[PDB]
Symmetry: none
Subunit: 125 residues, 6 copies
C-alpha cells in the first residue's frame, strides 16, 4: 500500500482605503513617495492638508545685471527628481569619454516567489 497527497490554499491581501504591496521577492530599484492616506471629517470649519507647502513670493529668480559677461545661472534644477545622469550642466566646453559612469548595468537573477516540493523515492509495491 502506497498513499500520498499535496495541498495548498492561497488568498491575497485585503486593502481598505490604503496602499499595499504584498510580497515582492527579488526587486531592484524601488521608489515610492507621497502615497498618502487620510481621513478627514470636517464640521463647521476649514481643513488644509498638504505634505509640501512652499509659500515663496520671490523664489529662485535672478536680479537685474546690465552689461554682464559670461554668466552661468541654474536655479531650482533637479527638484523632486530621480536618475539625472550627467545632466543639466551649466558649462561652455564638455568632453566625456571612457568605459565609466555606468548606471544599473549587467545583473543576473534567479528568483522564485514560492516553492513547494514532495519527494517520494521508492515504495516498490
Amino acid at each position: 500500500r502506497c498513499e500520498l497527497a499535496a495541498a495548498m490554499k492561497r488568498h491575497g491581501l485585503d486593502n481598505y482605503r490604503g496602499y499595499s504591496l504584498g510580497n515582492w521577492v527579488c526587486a531592484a530599484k524601488f521608489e515610492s513617495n507621497f502615497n498618502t492616506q487620510a481621513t478627514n471629517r470636517n464640521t463647521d470649519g476649514s481643513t488644509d492638508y498638504g505634505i509640501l507647502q512652499i509659500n515663496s513670493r520671490w523664489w529662485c529668480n535672478d536680479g537685474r545685471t546690465p552689461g554682464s559677461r559670461n554668466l552661468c545661472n541654474i536655479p531650482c534644477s533637479a527638484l523632486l527628481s530621480s536618475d539625472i545622469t550627467a545632466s543639466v550642466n551649466c558649462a561652455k566646453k564638455i568632453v566625456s569619454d571612457g568605459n565609466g559612469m555606468n548606471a544599473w548595468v549587467a545583473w543576473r537573477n534567479r528568483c522564485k516567489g514560492t516553492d513547494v516540493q514532495a519527494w517520494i523515492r521508492g515504495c516498490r509495491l
Copy 2:
C-alpha cells in the same frame, strides 16, 4: 503500508487606511518618503497639516550685479531628489574619462521568497 502528505495555508495582510508592504525578500535600492497617514476630526475650527512647510518671502534668488564677469550661480539645486550622478555642474570646462564613477552595477541574485520540502527516500513496500 506507506502513507504521506503535505499541506500549506497562506493569507495576505489586512490594511485599513494604511501603508503596508508585507515581506520583500532580496530587495536592492528602496526609497520611501512622505507616505503619510492621518485621521482628522475637526469641529468648529481650522486644522492645517503638512510635513514640509517653507514660508520664505525671498528664497534663493540673486541680487543686482551690473557690469559683472564670469559668474557661476546655482541656487536650490538637487532639492528633494535621488540619484543625481555627475549632474547639474556649474563650470566652464568639463573633462570626464575612465572606468570609474559606476552606480549599482553587476549584481548576482539567487533568492527564494518561501521554500517547503518533503523528502522520502525508501519505504520499499
Copy 3:
C-alpha cells in the same frame, strides 16, 4: 507501517491607519523618512501640524555686487536629498578619471525568506 506529514499556516500583518513592512530578508539600501502617523481631534480651536516648518523671510539669496569678477555661488544645494555622486559642483575646470568613485557595485546574494524541510531516509517496509 510508515506514516508522515508536513503542515504550515501563514497570515500577513494587520495594519490600522499605520505604516508597516513585515519581514524583509536580505535588503540593501533602504531609505524611509517623513512617513508620519497622526490622529487629530480638534473642537473649537486651530491645530497646525508639520515636521519641517521653516519661516525664513530672507533665506539663501545673494546681495548686490556691481562690477564683480569670477564668482562662485551655490546656495541651498542638495537639500533633503539622497545619492548626489560628484554632482552640482561650482568650478571652472573639471578633470575626472580612473577606476574609482564607485557606488553600490558588484554584489552577490543568496537569500531565502523562509525554509521548511522534512528529511526521511529509510523506512524500508
Copy 4:
C-alpha cells in the same frame, strides 16, 4: 411799509434694515414685541438664531386617570397673548352682571402733531 413771511421745511426718517416709528403724539395702547433686527455673516459654520426656543419633549399634557369624576384641566392657556377679558374659564356655573369689568372705555382726545402760528395785529399803513 409792512413786510412779513412764514417758512417750514420737513423731511421724514431714514431707515436702513431697521424698525422705526418717528413721532406719535397722543397714542393709547401700543404693543410691540419680537420686532427683531439681525445681521449674520456665516462662513464655514452653523448659526442658529431665535428669541424663544422651547425644547420640551413632554410639555403641558395630562396623564392617565381611569374612572375619574368632575375634572377641570386647562394647560398652556393665554400663551403669548393680549386682551383676554373674562375668557377661557374652567368652571361648571358662570353668572356675570353689572356695570363693571370695563376695558378702555369713554376717552376724550384733543391732539395736534405740530402747530405753527404767525400773529400780526396792526401795521395800519
Copy 5:
C-alpha cells in the same frame, strides 16, 4: 417800517439696523419686549443666539391619578402675556357683579407734539 418772519427746519431720525421711536408725546400703555438687535460674524464655528431658551424634557404636565374626584388643574397659564382680566379661572361656581374691576377707563387728553408762536401786537405804520 415793520418787517417780520418765522422759520422752522425739521428732519427725522437716522436708523441703521436698529429699533428706534423718536418722540412720543402723551402716550398711555406702551409695551415692548424682545425687540432684539444683533450682529454675528461666524467663521469656522457654531453660534447659538436666544433670549429665552427652556430645555425641559418634562415641563408642566400632570401625572396618573386613577379614581380621582373634583380636580382643578391649570398648568402654564398666562405665559408671556398681557391684559388677562378676570380670565382663565379654575372653579365650579363664578358670580361677578358691580361697578368695579375697570381697566383703562375714562381718560382726557390735551396734547401737542410741537408748538411755535410769533406774537406781534401793534406796529401801527
Copy 6:
C-alpha cells in the same frame, strides 16, 4: 423801524444697531424687557448667548395621586407676564362685587412736547 424774527432747526437721533427712543414727554405705563444688543465675532469656536436659560428636565409637573379628592393644582402660572387682574384663580366658589379693584382709570393730561413763543406788544411806528 420795527424788525423781528423766529428760527428753529431740529434733527432726530442717529441709531446704529441699537435700541433708542428719544424724548417721550408725558408717558404712562411703559414696559420694555429683553430688547438686547449684541455683537459676536466667533472664529474657530462655539458661542451660546441667552438671557434666560432654564435647563429643567422635570419642571413644574404633578405626581401620581390615585384615589384623590378636591385637588387644586396651578403650576407655572403668570410666567413672564404683565397685567393679570383677578385672573387664573384655583377655587370652587367665586363672588366679586363693588366699586373696587380698578386699574389705570380716569386720568387727565395736558402735555406739550416742545413750546416756542415770541411776544411783541407795541412798537407803534
